[PDB]
Write an enzyme that holds these catalytic residues in place. Sequence first.
Site, short mmCIF file in Angstrom:
data_model
loop_
_atom_site.label_atom_id
_atom_site.label_comp_id
_atom_site.label_asym_id
_atom_site.label_seq_id
_atom_site.Cartn_x
_atom_site.Cartn_y
_atom_site.Cartn_z
N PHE A 150 8.26 8.20 -10.48
CA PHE A 150 9.45 7.14 -9.59
C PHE A 150 9.12 7.38 -7.92
O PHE A 150 8.62 7.63 -7.32
CB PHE A 150 10.11 8.19 -10.02
CG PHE A 150 10.59 9.17 -11.05
CD1 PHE A 150 11.02 8.03 -12.22
CD2 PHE A 150 9.86 10.44 -11.03
CE1 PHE A 150 11.17 9.06 -12.79
CE2 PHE A 150 10.08 10.77 -12.07
CZ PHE A 150 10.56 10.08 -13.55
N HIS A 184 -5.33 -5.46 -2.47
CA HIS A 184 -6.97 -5.42 -0.98
C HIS A 184 -7.42 -7.33 -0.97
O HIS A 184 -8.50 -7.07 -0.20
CB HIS A 184 -8.38 -5.06 -2.32
CG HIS A 184 -7.88 -3.33 -2.26
ND1 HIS A 184 -9.00 -3.10 -3.84
CD2 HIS A 184 -7.40 -2.80 -1.84
CE1 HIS A 184 -7.85 -1.46 -2.64
NE2 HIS A 184 -7.39 -2.10 -2.22
N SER A 201 7.28 10.35 -2.41
CA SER A 201 6.81 11.53 -2.02
C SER A 201 5.64 11.37 -1.30
O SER A 201 5.10 11.86 -1.12
CB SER A 201 6.26 11.66 -3.49
OG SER A 201 5.51 10.34 -4.55
N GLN A 227 0.65 -1.22 0.31
CA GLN A 227 0.28 -0.28 -0.31
C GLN A 227 1.24 1.36 0.32
O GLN A 227 -0.05 2.27 -0.66
CB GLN A 227 -0.52 0.77 1.10
CG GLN A 227 -2.01 1.73 1.42
CD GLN A 227 -2.45 1.13 2.09
OE1 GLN A 227 -2.78 0.92 3.33
NE2 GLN A 227 -4.24 1.23 1.94
N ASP A 236 9.77 8.14 -4.84
CA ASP A 236 11.23 8.56 -4.88
C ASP A 236 9.88 9.31 -2.84
O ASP A 236 10.83 10.17 -3.06
CB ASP A 236 10.97 9.37 -5.70
CG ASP A 236 9.80 10.16 -6.17
OD1 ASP A 236 8.50 9.92 -5.60
OD2 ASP A 236 9.61 11.33 -6.47
N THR A 249 4.49 12.01 -8.25
CA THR A 249 4.98 11.40 -9.00
C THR A 249 5.19 9.89 -9.86
O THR A 249 5.70 8.91 -8.91
CB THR A 249 6.74 11.93 -8.98
OG1 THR A 249 6.62 11.12 -7.81
CG2 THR A 249 6.25 13.58 -8.26
N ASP A 309 2.53 1.61 -3.26
CA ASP A 309 1.29 1.70 -4.64
C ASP A 309 1.24 3.04 -4.25
O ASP A 309 0.89 3.74 -5.29
CB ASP A 309 0.49 1.60 -3.56
CG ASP A 309 -1.06 1.32 -4.71
OD1 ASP A 309 -1.98 2.23 -4.63
OD2 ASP A 309 -1.27 0.52 -5.54
N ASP A 324 3.21 5.62 -3.40
CA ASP A 324 4.32 6.44 -3.96
C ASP A 324 4.34 6.41 -5.39
O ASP A 324 4.38 7.90 -5.83
CB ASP A 324 5.51 5.78 -3.23
CG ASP A 324 6.69 6.39 -3.90
OD1 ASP A 324 6.75 7.08 -5.04
OD2 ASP A 324 7.74 6.75 -2.85
N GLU A 349 -6.53 6.90 5.94
CA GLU A 349 -7.44 5.53 5.60
C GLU A 349 -7.07 4.68 6.48
O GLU A 349 -8.81 4.06 6.31
CB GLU A 349 -6.93 5.45 3.96
CG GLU A 349 -7.89 4.68 3.27
CD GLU A 349 -8.53 3.14 3.58
OE1 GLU A 349 -6.97 2.78 4.26
OE2 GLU A 349 -9.19 1.93 3.33
C1 HEM Z 1 -8.93 0.35 3.49
C2 HEM Z 1 -7.98 -0.08 2.29
C3 HEM Z 1 -6.87 -0.61 2.34
C4 HEM Z 1 -6.60 -2.07 3.02
C5 HEM Z 1 -7.38 -2.16 4.69
C6 HEM Z 1 -6.36 -0.93 0.80
C7 HEM Z 1 -5.01 -1.46 0.75
C8 HEM Z 1 -4.46 -1.70 -0.37
C9 HEM Z 1 -3.45 -2.17 -0.72
C10 HEM Z 1 -2.40 -3.46 0.46
C11 HEM Z 1 -3.12 -2.05 -1.46
C12 HEM Z 1 -1.39 -3.00 -2.67
C13 HEM Z 1 -0.61 -3.74 -1.91
C14 HEM Z 1 -3.72 -1.62 -2.82
C15 HEM Z 1 -3.58 -0.93 -3.47
C16 HEM Z 1 -5.05 0.14 -4.29
N1 HEM Z 1 -5.77 1.21 -3.04
FE1 HEM Z 1 -6.57 0.18 -1.38
N2 HEM Z 1 -6.78 -0.25 0.59
C17 HEM Z 1 -7.76 0.72 0.99
C18 HEM Z 1 -8.96 1.11 0.66
C19 HEM Z 1 -9.05 2.01 -0.52
C20 HEM Z 1 -9.66 3.13 -1.08
C21 HEM Z 1 -10.76 2.90 -0.79
C22 HEM Z 1 -9.26 3.04 -2.98
C23 HEM Z 1 -9.93 3.99 -3.90
C24 HEM Z 1 -10.45 3.61 -5.17
C25 HEM Z 1 -11.56 3.68 -5.57
O1 HEM Z 1 -10.88 4.02 -6.99
O2 HEM Z 1 -12.11 5.12 -5.17
C26 HEM Z 1 -8.34 2.19 -2.51
C27 HEM Z 1 -7.72 2.34 -3.93
C28 HEM Z 1 -6.26 1.69 -4.45
C29 HEM Z 1 -5.25 1.67 -5.66
C30 HEM Z 1 -5.67 2.94 -6.90
C31 HEM Z 1 -4.96 4.13 -6.43
C32 HEM Z 1 -5.37 5.06 -7.64
O3 HEM Z 1 -4.07 5.03 -8.66
O4 HEM Z 1 -6.10 5.52 -7.32
C33 HEM Z 1 -4.08 1.10 -5.14
C34 HEM Z 1 -2.90 0.78 -6.65
N3 HEM Z 1 -7.72 1.37 -1.43
N4 HEM Z 1 -4.83 -0.89 -1.53
C1 LIG Z 2 -4.87 2.82 -0.64
N1 LIG Z 2 -5.61 2.61 -0.04
CA LIG Z 3 6.27 8.84 -6.49
#
Ligand code: HEM
Ligand SMILES: [C-]#N
Ligand SMILES: [Ca+2]
EC number: 1.11.1.7
Length: 595
Positions: free
Chosen positions: A186, A351, A190, A105, A188, A184, A108, A110, A258
């Site tokens: 990278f 998730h 952020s 997470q 990095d 960003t 991600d 980042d 969150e």
């Molecule tokens: C509560 C939430 C989590 C844990 C208790 C949780 C966990 C993760 C992990 C472990 C991820 C990767 C290994 C991961 C990736 C991405 N999530 Fe995310 N997450 C919880 C809750 C949310 C909610 C709410 C969203 C919003 C979804 C939407 O489209 O409205 C969410 C998103 C994402 C996401 C998209 C990021 C982006 O590019 O906008 C991941 C790549 N998670 N979660």
């Molecule tokens: C990711 N929330």
């Molecule tokens: Ca970044």
Amino acid sequence: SWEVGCGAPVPLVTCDEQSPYRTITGDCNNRRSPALGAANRALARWLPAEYEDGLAVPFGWTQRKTRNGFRVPLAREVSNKIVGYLDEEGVLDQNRSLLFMQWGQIVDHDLDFAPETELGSSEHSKVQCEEYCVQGDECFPIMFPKNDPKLKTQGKCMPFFRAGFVCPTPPYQSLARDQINAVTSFLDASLVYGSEPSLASRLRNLSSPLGLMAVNQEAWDHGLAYPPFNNVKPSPCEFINTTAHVPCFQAGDSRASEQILLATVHTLLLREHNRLARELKRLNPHWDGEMLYQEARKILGAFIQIITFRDYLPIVLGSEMQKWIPPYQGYNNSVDPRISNVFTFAFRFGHMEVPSTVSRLDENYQPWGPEAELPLHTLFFNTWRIIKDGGIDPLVRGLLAKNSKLMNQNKMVTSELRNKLFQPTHKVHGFDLAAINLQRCRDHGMPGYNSWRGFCGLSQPKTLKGLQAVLKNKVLAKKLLDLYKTPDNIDIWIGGNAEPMVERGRVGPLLACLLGRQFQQIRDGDRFWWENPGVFTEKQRDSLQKVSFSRLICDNTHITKVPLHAFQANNYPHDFVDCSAVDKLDLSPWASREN
Ligand code: HEM
Ligand SMILES: [C-]#N
Ligand SMILES: [Ca+2]
Ligand SMILES: *[C@@H]1O[C@H](CO)[C@@H](O[C@@H]2O[C@H](CO)[C@@H](O[C@@H]3O[C@H](CO)[C@@H](O)[C@H](O)[C@@H]3O)[C@H](O)[C@H]2NC(C)=O)[C@H](O)[C@H]1NC(C)=O
Ligand SMILES: *[C@@H]1O[C@H](CO)[C@@H](O[C@@H]2O[C@H](CO)[C@@H](O[C@H]3O[C@H](CO)[C@@H](O)[C@H](O)[C@@H]3O)[C@H](O)[C@H]2NC(C)=O)[C@H](O)[C@H]1NC(C)=O
Ligand SMILES: *[C@@H]1O[C@H](CO)[C@@H](O[C@@H]2O[C@H](CO)[C@@H](O[C@H]3O[C@H](CO)[C@@H](O)[C@H](O)[C@@H]3O)[C@H](O)[C@H]2NC(C)=O)[C@H](O)[C@H]1NC(C)=O
Ligand SMILES: *[C@@H]1O[C@H](CO)[C@@H](O[C@@H]2O[C@H](CO)[C@@H](O)[C@H](O)[C@H]2NC(C)=O)[C@H](O)[C@H]1NC(C)=O
């Protein structure tokens, strides 16, 4: 094509051309093309967008219109029939700590963030979507199918607003809708330092010239820091317990609060910065604040890449690692560093790794108090349990001692996530993360499962029997087609996660492919990669190879027993050693000797 240069809030400036430090926005990383990889630009497309009207209307918007001849099944229904399960027994990953989930997470966050459309500050559109479930402009409601228990109890639908897009944000029309990335591309750090110059300044303590990051002045954790409260009100974190009135934390990224565990590791990263910044002053007393902040910021980022590529990715991708991420060969200016749209969905594999409870353990790694183990749902936007109930030490131990949830074809996403999700904007604990993902897939214009199987050179099943063979599961394959009518229509998110896991990894063939490619690109395309000659010195790199998350815990908490390998399931106390047995980060190579 069209308009080889659209774009808005794309800010200020151009390259210092010879500075040893990354910009905050991500600009100037690449020299020939300076915007490449910056924040607030479109997510890249590896494949043409697929909308209902070929331009921006998500499949499932207009209901006489089909996709390849069939109606797309409701998001919530695919959730109810295929994603959910009741029995939480035996769903844990026997060889991956809860930290394995948590680090995903972070990385991600980042790399990507496509923010929801706004145009809502004293609006009733927020209400037209909430109160009447009226599909309209940016409101694209998740309806409940017949017999959904949420009908008797919440309403007719779950509000849901579409993500933001490039040229403007108000209506628009001309070409194909591209969603924005506000962070960003990278790796990095952020999420710690911000992706905007305005925000990155605010986070800093510019009162003392010590290159430190602003810390909390109202609460302390045994003399250890806490990130600062965010003072925008209304506050989500306040709403979940009006009596404690504890606001959310303020960090480089807006999602920091969150869930309780994400906030926790956010604090570890905040503490490691200030730690580094003052260790670096000790050694180089002449250095000014700016140089402290920047050298600290560089080391920390180096930290996030090393952990990510050495310790995390190998146990995610598994036997598929080498296939996709061959060993490093130096920076390649011809490689596109940008995060692709589909990645933002493929990386959501996590998730299905989030377990139903979170625990607080004492100094002997024993249950901490009468209410040690908490439902995950009571922890979204919960900061009072940290400030007012133990600090982060009890939570860090949970992370180290407890297992992640193993992805399971019969037990996909825990109900704490699929039925009781809290959303900042709203008031109820009853959203569905599984349904939102599916809805969002269509919002972004994702192509289907087979188009992606193809992209990666895997087979493209067309029949119930063909899917059977891919998924190695009859009942799953059958439920999937009863709803989608053809393997072509299955949404990338669920289609990808339904595959069996590859040897020694935690995702399957299709996912390994999407994830692999992306990580190979952000590494090969980043001018400031920690291994790239010139960024750090022989001596500096050598010392950096010695970092570990366990050490990060030791220097920054009052935990004195930790595993060596924090990503794998470890038992207490056999697998735990004293912090004194853990390799430290030698910062001597950072000393600047004069004259
Ligand atoms: C509560 C939430 C989590 C844990 C208790 C949780 C966990 C993760 C992990 C472990 C991820 C990767 C290994 C991961 C990736 C991405 N999530 Fe995310 N997450 C919880 C809750 C949310 C909610 C709410 C969203 C919003 C979804 C939407 O489209 O409205 C969410 C998103 C994402 C996401 C998209 C990021 C982006 O590019 O906008 C991941 C790549 N998670 N979660
Ligand atoms: C990711 N929330
Ligand atoms: Ca970044
Ligand atoms: C809202 O937040 C407050 C925290 O500010 C929560 O109140 C806490 O409630 C518990 C008992 O319900 C109090 O602890 C009690 O005393 C001792 C701890 O020193 C313990 O041994 C007892 O068994 C008992 O648990 C705690 O002091 C109290 N915090 C304060 C200062 O109010 C409350 O539960 C939250 N309510 C909601 C809406 O979630
Ligand atoms: C739980 O997950 C652990 C973390 O991945 C895993 O440890 C891995 O063990 C193997 C041992 O085979 C190591 O892989 C290398 O092993 C030898 C070197 O001794 C090489 O000849 C092999 O080709 C291979 O490269 C890994 O180093 C190690 N992983 C890490 C990251 O430490 C455990 O085996 C898992 N436990 C169970 C019960 O499955
Ligand atoms: C920006 O940097 C400032 C300089 O480090 C920092 O001020 C310092 O704050 C610490 C912690 O609040 C104080 O140190 C301790 O003072 C006594 C010990 O003598 C303790 O009882 C306190 O609880 C505290 O731990 C310093 O007094 C203070 N330094 C000076 C010389 O004023 C600011 O807090 C930083 N600002 C932000 C917003 O992060
Ligand atoms: C940098 O990476 C690029 C991108 O993969 C590589 O470019 C390839 O170059 C060959 C000719 O040498 C072309 O046939 C391909 O078009 C390129 N590959 C693809 C599929 O993109 C290149 O190997 C790398 N350059 C250096 C100097 O390492």
